[PDB]
């Protein structure tokens, strides 16, 4: 047996050290630890997009809860905040809904007034003032 | 468990031996010894592969030709078997035809 393998034990440890916290014989036997470690690393790679999606749905749930406490619905809140050029995303809006309820009531009041000016604009087609909390700022 | 527990005894090698110091002396003799001997005549080994590279089948054919008249009976039977098998392998089986 010319040049047969000597450090086979270290590849076994390199696979097994990511499998210590398993359950059953998967934490000891190499022939099963290989498959379970490969599936674990695959799910770890795939779970990034699911993490981002779950965080965004959690943000939408918390924003919907707070806006429903303020007597508004969620699409009205987001649409009438983006119509006043305030470009806050769902993360900081959820954090303001939790930790800063006064300014969230202020934002809900802003969205309600932009909604009411939109209703008056749709009833009147303009004529005169096109609202006050409208008149978006023009950049060039 | 395969690994050895205690580390082995350290192997000492004398690089300034008789052999390793005088490795390759009188090689390259025919260039600057006005061609009396060839460098293949320094090679000390078997009588049949002395200055001859060959294949695996070609070595066994040359061994049956130059030496096989004074081999052992078991080795001569094994050599005939090996040459028969290597003919059947090289000329019939394989890729690239």
């Amino acid at each position: 047996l010319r040049n047969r393998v000597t450090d086979r034990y270290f590849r076994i440890q390199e696979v097994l050290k990511h499998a210590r916290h398993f359950r059953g014989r998967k934490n000891r036997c190499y022939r099963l630890a290989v498959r379970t470690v490969i599936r674990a690393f695959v799910k770890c790679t795939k779970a990034r997009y699911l993490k981002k999606k779950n965080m965004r749905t959690l943000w939408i749930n918390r924003i919907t809860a707070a806006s429903q406490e303020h007597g508004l619905k969620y699409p009205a809140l987001i649409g009438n905040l983006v119509k006043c050029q305030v470009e806050l995303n769902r993360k900081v809006l959820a954090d303001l809904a939790i930790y800063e309820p006064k300014t969230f009531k202020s934002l809900a009041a802003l969205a309600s007034r932009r909604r009411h000016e939109g209703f008056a604009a749709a009833l009147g087609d303009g004529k005169e003032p096109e609202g006050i909390f409208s008149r978006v700022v023009q950049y060039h | 468990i395969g690994i050895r527990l205690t580390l082995p005894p350290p192997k000492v090698v004398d690089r300034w031996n008789e052999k390793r110091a005088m490795f390759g002396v009188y090689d390259n003799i025919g260039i600057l010894g006005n061609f009396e001997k060839h460098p293949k005549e320094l090679i000390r080994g078997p009588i049949w592969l002395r200055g001859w590279k060959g294949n695996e089948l070609q070595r066994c054919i040359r061994k049956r030709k130059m030496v096989g008249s004074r081999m052992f009976a078991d080795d001569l039977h094994n050599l005939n078997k090996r040459i028969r098998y290597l003919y059947k392998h090289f000329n019939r089986h394989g890729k690239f035809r």
Partner: peptide
């Protein structure tokens, strides 16, 4: 025996790692 040196040395360092981990010094 499996002939060679690097694997036995690496395992000796790993044994010293686990042996120092089991009984930590003052």
């Amino acid at each position: 025996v499996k002939k060679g040196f690097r694997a036995a040395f690496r395992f000796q360092k790993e044994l010293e790692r686990q042996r120092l981990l089991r009984c930590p010094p003052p």
